[PDB]
C-alpha cells in the first residue's frame, strides 16, 4: 500500500514542471476514422500525432494546406474544433522474451487481462531489411510435421513460404500444426491474426495452450471490429517482435494470417484518403506494402549478429521464417493480391477444395506446389528418400485422365496407377499430431521398397499407423538416433529394413 505511494510521489515530483513551445493544428473534418487538420507545418510523414482527448493518430497525407491522419483508437469521440499536436515520434512496440505466452493488441497492449507486460526494450515498427551483404544461404530445416510438405515442399530457416487456397480448406490448421511441431527445435513463434472474429482467436489460443505450445508463442490480435489502422499495422508490429530474436542469434517463425484482409484494410484506408485506385480498386502501391513486410524475413550471417550485439553473441547466426496466408476466390490465382504475393515468396502450398472433400487431408496439391530452396532445406535422410515419392506422384499425375479406365490398359501403366494410388493414400494425416523425421523416414522407406505393394488401398493408413507405433515400441534407440541427427548409413538402412520385415512377418496390423 505504500510502494504505490512512493512511486506516485517520486513521479509527481519528478516532472510536469516546465513549459514547452509546440506546433499545433485544428481538427476540421471527421468521417469514418479519417481526420483532417489545418496546421502542423512540421508534421512528418508517418509521425505520431496526439489529440486533446488522449487519442493517437498517424499522419499519412501531407497535402499543401491539410494533413490527413488515421485514428488509432475509436474516432467517435472526436469533434471538429479540437486541437492536435505533433510529437516528433514514430510508432514503437515493446519487444523481448516477456511477450511469450501473451496476447497483445496491434500496439503491444495486453488484452488477455493477465496484468501489465514488463518489457525493457521498444523498437520501431517501420524498419528496413538488412542489405544483401549481410545475408547467408538457407541450409537449415524447419519441420512442419506433414509427410507431404516435408518431403515435397520443404521449408528452410529464413525462407518465406506461402499458404494459398480457397476458404475452409485447412490453411489455419497447417499454420497451427507448424507452430505446434516446433516444441523441441527451440525456435520461437509469433502468430498474427488479422480480421478474425475474437471467438476464433480465443479458440486458437486455447488449443495452443492445451498442447503446451503457448510457452514460446506470442499472439498479435487485430480483430474484425478493430479500426482499419490496426489491421493495417498489425503485421509490421508482429514482424518487429519476431526480429527481436533474429538480431540476437536465435531463430524465430512468424505466421501472418490472411494478408488478404490486411490488403483490404489498406484499400479502405487509401480510398477514404482520395488516392487514385488501380485494378480492383486497390491502391497502386499494394505491392510495396507487402514487399517491405515480407522482405524482412531472412537469415543473417554471424558477422551481422556480432556487430548488432557488440560482441555478445559472437558464435551464432539469426533467422526469421514467414508463412503468409492468402485466400482465393474459386481458385482464381490470377487476381491482384495473390499475383503480387506469389511473386515475392520463395514458393507456395496450394490447398484444393476438391481434394479436401475426397478425403485427402491435408489437401496439398503436389502438381503446382514448389519450394525454390529445394533440397538444401532437408535433412540428409529425408533428402535421400523423397525422390521415390516425388517420381511416384509425378507418374500417377501424368496419366490421371485414365484413372477410371484401368480395365482397358497395358500392365505397366496399371502398375503405375496401383503404386500411385497407394502413395497418394500414404500422404493422409490427422490434425494436431505431427511426425518427427524418423516416422516420415520409416514410412517413406517402407513405401519406396514396395512393402506396401501387397496391401489393399483401403487399409494403408492403418498399416502406416501400426508400423510407426511398432517402431516406437520395439526400436526406441534407432528412432532416437535418426531423430537426433538425421544420418543415413548402411547400418540405418539395414536396421529399418529388418524392422519392416519383422513387422510384416509378426505383427498383422
Amino acid at each position: 500500500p505504500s510502494e504505490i505511494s512512493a512511486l506516485i510521489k517520486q513521479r509527481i515530483g519528478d516532472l510536469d514542471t516546465s513549459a514547452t513551445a509546440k506546433n499545433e493544428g485544428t481538427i476540421v473534418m471527421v468521417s469514418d476514422g479519417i481526420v483532417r487538420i489545418h496546421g502542423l507545418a512540421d508534421a512528418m510523414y508517418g509521425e505520431m500525432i496526439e489529440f486533446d482527448g488522449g487519442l493517437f493518430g498517424m499522419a499519412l497525407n501531407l497535402e499543401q494546406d491539410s494533413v490527413g491522419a488515421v485514428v488509432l483508437g475509436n474516432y467517435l469521440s472526436l469533434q471538429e474544433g479540437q486541437k492536435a499536436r505533433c510529437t516528433g515520434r514514430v510508432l514503437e512496440v515493446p519487444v523481448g522474451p516477456e511477450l511469450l505466452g501473451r496476447v497483445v493488441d496491434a500496439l503491444g497492449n495486453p488484452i488477455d487481462g493477465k496484468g501489465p507486460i514488463d518489457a525493457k526494450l521498444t523498437d520501431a515498427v517501420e524498419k528496413v531489411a538488412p542489405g544483401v551483404i549481410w545475408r547467408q544461404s538457407v541450409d537449415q530445416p524447419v519441420q512442419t510435421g506433414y509427410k507431404s510438405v516435408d518431403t515435397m515442399i520443404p521449408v528452410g530457416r529464413g525462407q518465406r513460404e506461402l499458404i494459398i487456397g480457397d476458404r475452409q480448406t485447412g490453411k489455419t490448421a497447417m499454420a497451427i500444426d507448424a507452430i505446434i511441431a516446433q516444441k523441441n527445435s527451440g525456435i520461437k513463434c509469433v502468430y498474427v491474426a488479422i480480421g478474425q472474429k475474437q471467438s476464433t482467436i480465443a479458440n486458437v489460443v486455447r488449443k495452443l495452450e492445451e498442447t503446451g505450445a503457448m510457452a514460446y508463442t506470442t499472439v498479435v490480435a487485430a480483430a474484425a471490429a478493430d479500426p482499419a489502422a490496426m489491421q493495417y499495422l498489425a503485421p509490421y508490429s508482429g514482424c518487429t517482435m519476431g526480429e527481436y530474436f533474429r538480431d540476437r542469434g536465435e531463430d524465430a517463425l512468424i505466421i501472418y494470417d490472411d494478408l488478404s484482409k490486411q490488403a483490404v484494410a489498406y484499400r479502405q484506408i487509401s480510398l477514404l484518403l482520395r488516392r487514385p485506385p488501380g485494378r480492383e480498386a486497390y491502391p497502386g502501391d499494394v505491392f510495396y506494402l507487402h514487399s517491405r513486410l515480407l522482405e524482412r524475413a531472412s537469415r543473417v550471417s554471424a558477422e551481422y549478429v556480432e556487430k548488432f550485439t557488440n560482441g555478445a553473441v559472437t558464435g551464432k547466426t539469426g533467422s526469421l521464417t514467414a508463412l503468409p496466408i492468402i485466400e482465393t476466390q474459386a481458385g482464381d490465382v490470377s487476381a491482384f493480391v495473390p499475383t503480387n504475393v506469389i511473386s515475392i515468396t520463395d514458393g507456395q502450398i496450394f490447398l484444393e477444395t476438391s481434394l479436401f472433400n475426397a478425403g485427402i487431408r491435408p489437401a496439398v496439391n503436389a502438381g503446382i506446389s514448389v519450394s525454390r530452396v529445394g533440397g538444401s532445406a532437408q535433412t540428409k535422410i529425408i533428402k535421400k528418400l523423397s525422390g521415390g515419392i516425388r517420381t511416384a506422384l509425378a507418374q500417377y499425375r501424368e496419366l490421371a485422365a485414365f484413372a477410371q479406365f484401368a480395365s482397358d490398359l497395358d500392365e505397366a501403366t496399371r502398375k503405375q496407377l496401383e503404386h500411385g494410388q497407394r502413395v497418394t493414400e500414404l500422404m493422409k494425416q490427422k490434425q494436431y499430431a505431427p511426425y518427427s523425421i524418423a516416422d516420415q523416414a520409416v514410412s517413406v522407406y517402407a513405401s519406396n521398397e514396395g512393402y506396401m505393394a501387397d496391401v489393399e488401398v483401403k487399409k494403408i493408413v492403418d498399416f502406416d499407423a501400426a508400423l510407426i507405433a511398432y517402431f516406437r515400441s520395439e526400436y526406441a534407440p534407432l528412432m532416437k538416433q535418426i531423430d537426433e541427427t538425421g544420418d543415413y548409413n548402411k547400418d540405418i538402412e539395414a536396421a529399418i529394413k529388418a524392422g519392416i520385415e519383422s513387422f510384416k512377418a509378426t505383427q498383422t496390423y
Binding site: 476540421v28 469514418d32 482467436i201 480465443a202 484482409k261 477410371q404
Partner: protein, 463 residues
C-alpha cells in the same frame, strides 16, 4: 442552438449549425415541422454535419429549422418489449399502446472485449437429417443459411424455430431487415395463434422503407438481445437468448445505396469502401460472453447466385456453421436444398461428435465427391464404360442424395404430407446401413421424402 437544412439528395440531408454547437458523430436530430429523425454520419466542418433520414424525405424544403437531442438513438428494453412489434426507433406499431418500460439503451455500442469471451461446445439437435449429420450446431454459436433467391432460406429458418424455440425455455428476438411484410404478418399471427407470443420481441424495418430505416434496424434488434443476455434475476441465472435475423445482406445493401451520397469512392464492384469494417462492427456484438449465451440464426442472401460476391464472401469468416443452399438441388425437387459438399461446421471433429458420427459423415462426403467427379464421364460416354465399383458408387450416391430429403412441419402447406422429426441416432443408423450396402436392393425412389430408415423399407414394400 438549432440548425437548418441546406441540401437534400435522396436520403442524405445535411444541416448547418453554429460554430460552437455542432453535434457528435451519432447524435439524433429532429426536424421541427415534421416527424423525420436524422442521424449524423459525417462532420464536414465549418459547422456543417451530414446526416441520413430515418423516414421518407418527400416534401422537405431547404431552410427548415432542426433541433438536436445530444444523444444517440435510444430504444426501450426489458420485459415490456416481449410480445410487441417495434420499428427502428423503438415505437410500437402493433397498436397495443405505449410500452410500459422506462429503460433505455443507445443502439451504438462497442463489442465485448477479448477478455470476456466464453466459447462453449454443447451440441444442439435440430431433428433435420442433413443438418445433424453434416453441420451440427452448438448452443451459443452463430449459424448462417447462405443461398440464392428462392431456394428456401426463410422456410428453413422457420423450421429451425419450430424444432427449437417451441421447446426452448428462454426468450427470443426476431429482427426482420428488409423483407416481405407478408412474411412478418404471417409470423406474428403464427406466434399469436400458438401461445408463445409472450417469449418473442419483434423488430420490423422491412423492404418497403427508406434506406435509413433498413440500415439501423438490426442494431435495435440485437440491442434488445444484448440486454436480455446481460441480465440477472436474483436467486436466478442468466437467461438463454435466441436471435433470428432475416437477410442480414440487406443491412449492407442499404449501406451501399447511401455510399456515394456520403461522398466516397466506390470499391471493387459497387460496394462502399467500408464494407468489411461496417460488417464486423455489427457482427462482433452477436457473440456470447461470460454472462449469458446468444444462439444466432441468420439468413444471408447471395446476389445472382454468386458465392464469390464481396458481401457473402466477407460474411463467411463471421460464422461457426455455414449452411449453403443450392439452386440446382432445389430445381431437382430435393427439399431442403442444402448442398452436402459446401456445408461445414467447427463442431464436426472426432473429439466433439464422437468417432462413429465423424467417420459416417466423412464417408458420405467422399461418396458424394466421387459421384460428382464421375458425373462428367457418364455424360459423354455411357454408364457402361465404368467399372462395377463406379456404377455401385453412382447408385449409392443417388440413394444418398434422395435420402437427405425430408418433409418439414411447416412445408405441409405447399405439398400436403405431414412433417417428420428424425432423431440423430436414426440418421446415423440409416446412413451406416446405406454405406454398408445392405440397402442395394431398394429402388432409389423409396428414399425420397421420408423420415427414418424404417419408412424407406415400408415404402419399398408398398411399391
Amino acid at each position: 442552438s438549432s440548425g437548418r437544412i441546406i441540401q437534400i439528395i435522396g436520403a442524405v440531408i445535411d444541416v448547418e449549425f453554429e460554430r460552437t454547437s455542432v453535434p457528435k458523430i451519432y447524435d439524433a436530430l429532429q426536424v421541427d415541422g415534421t416527424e423525420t429523425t436524422l442521424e449524423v454520419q459525417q462532420q464536414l466542418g465549418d459547422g456543417v454535419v451530414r446526416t441520413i433520414a430515418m423516414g421518407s424525405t418527400e416534401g422537405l424544403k431547404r431552410g427548415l429549422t432542426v433541433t438536436s437531442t445530444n444523444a444517440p438513438i435510444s430504444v426501450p428494453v426489458g420485459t415490456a418489449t416481449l410480445g410487441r412489434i417495434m420499428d427502428v426507433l423503438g415505437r410500437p406499431i402493433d397498436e397495443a399502446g405505449p410500452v410500459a418500460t422506462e429503460e433505455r439503451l443507445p443502439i451504438h455500442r462497442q463489442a465485448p472485449s477479448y477478455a470476456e469471451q466464453a466459447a462453449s461446445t454443447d451440441l444442439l439437435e435440430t431433428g433435420i437429417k442433413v443438418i445433424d449429420l453434416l453441420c451440427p450446431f452448438a448452443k451459443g454459436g452463430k449459424v448462417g443459411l447462405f443461398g440464392g433467391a428462392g431456394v428456401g432460406k426463410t422456410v428453413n429458418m422457420m423450421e429451425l424455430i419450430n424444432n427449437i424455440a417451441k421447446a426452448h425455455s428462454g426468450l427470443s428476438v426476431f429482427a426482420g431487415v428488409g423483407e416481405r411484410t407478408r412474411e412478418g404478418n404471417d409470423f406474428y399471427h403464427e406466434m399469436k395463434d400458438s401461445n408463445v407470443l409472450d417469449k418473442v420481441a419483434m423488430v420490423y424495418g422491412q423492404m418497403n422503407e427508406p434506406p435509413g430505416n433498413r440500415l439501423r434496424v438490426a442494431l435495435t434488434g440485437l440491442t434488445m438481445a444484448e440486454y436480455f443476455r446481460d441480465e440477472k434475476d436474483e436467486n436466478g441465472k442468466g437467461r438463454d437468448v435466441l436471435l433470428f435475423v432475416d437477410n442480414i445482406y440487406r443491412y449492407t445493401l442499404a449501406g451501399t445505396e447511401v455510399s456515394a451520397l456520403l461522398g466516397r469512392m466506390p470499391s471493387a464492384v459497387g460496394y462502399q469502401p467500408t464494407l468489411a469494417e461496417e460488417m464486423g462492427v455489427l457482427q462482433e456484438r452477436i457473440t456470447s460472453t461470460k454472462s449469458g449465451s446468444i444462439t444466432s440464426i441468420q439468413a444471408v442472401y447471395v446476389p445472382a447466385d454468386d458465392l464469390t460476391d464481396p458481401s457473402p464472401a466477407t460474411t463467411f469468416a463471421h460464422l461457426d456453421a455455414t449452411v449453403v443452399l443450392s439452386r440446382d438441388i432445389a430445381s431437382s425437387g430435393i427439399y431442403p436444398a442444402i448442398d452436402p459438399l459446401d456445408s461445414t461446421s467447427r463442431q464436426l471433429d472426432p473429439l466433439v461428435v464422437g468417432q462413429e458420427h465423424y467417420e459416417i459423415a466423412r464417408a458420405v462426403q467422399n461418396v458424394l465427391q466421387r459421384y460428382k467427379e464421375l458425373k462428367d464421364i457418364i455424360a459423354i460416354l455411357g454408364m457402361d464404360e465404368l467399372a462395377e465399383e463406379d456404377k455401385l458408387v453412382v447408385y449409392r450416391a443417388r440413394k444418398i442424395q434422395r435420402f437427405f430429403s425430408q418433409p418439414f412441419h411447416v412445408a405441409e402447406v405447399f405439398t400436403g404430407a405431414p412433417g417428420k422429426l428424425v432423431p440423430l441416432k436414426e440418421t446415423i443408423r440409416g446412413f451406416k446401413g446405406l454405406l454398408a450396402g445392405e440397402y442395394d436392393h431398394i429402388p432409389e425412389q423409396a428414399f425420397y421424402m421420408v423420415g427414418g430408415i424404417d419408412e424407406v423399407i415400408a415404402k419399398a414394400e408398398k411399391l
